Design a binder for these strands. Structure first.
Length: 91
DNA sequence: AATAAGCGGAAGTGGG
DNA sequence: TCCCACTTTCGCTTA
């Protein structure tokens, strides 16, 4: 099954949910969610995973927080903004 | 108050 | 056995 960071990177590359997520500085790997349209993206994540419950942005963001220690995605001190690692961007 | 973003102890589910 | 990679529940903090 796809990993969450890869699901998000793939969306950013495809442009398929441009109103829910976008690059801030793609060279740095920084990206941001839409305040008003992030839930539709979270719903898509949960359906792609086949999870039992409806996925929420809060549960998805909790998964994102767990990447902080391994480094794939880090929270940026800007609203709804995160940053992929160079390793994730290079793969 | 109402709303929203951000955080995490603990415990459950999947597929190794 | 016991870690993977989240998922789910619920309370808390700050703005």
């Amino acid at each position: 099954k796809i990993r969450l960071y890869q699901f998000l990177l793939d969306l950013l590359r495809s442009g398929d949910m441009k109103d829910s997520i976008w690059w801030v500085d793609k060279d740095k790997g920084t990206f941001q969610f839409s305040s008003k349209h992030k839930e539709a993206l979270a719903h898509r994540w949960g359906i792609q995973k086949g999870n039992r419950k409806k996925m929420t942005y809060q549960k998805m963001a909790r998964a994102l927080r767990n990447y902080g220690k391994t480094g794939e995605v880090k929270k940026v001190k800007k609203k709804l903004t995160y940053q992929f690692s160079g390793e994730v961007l290079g793969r």
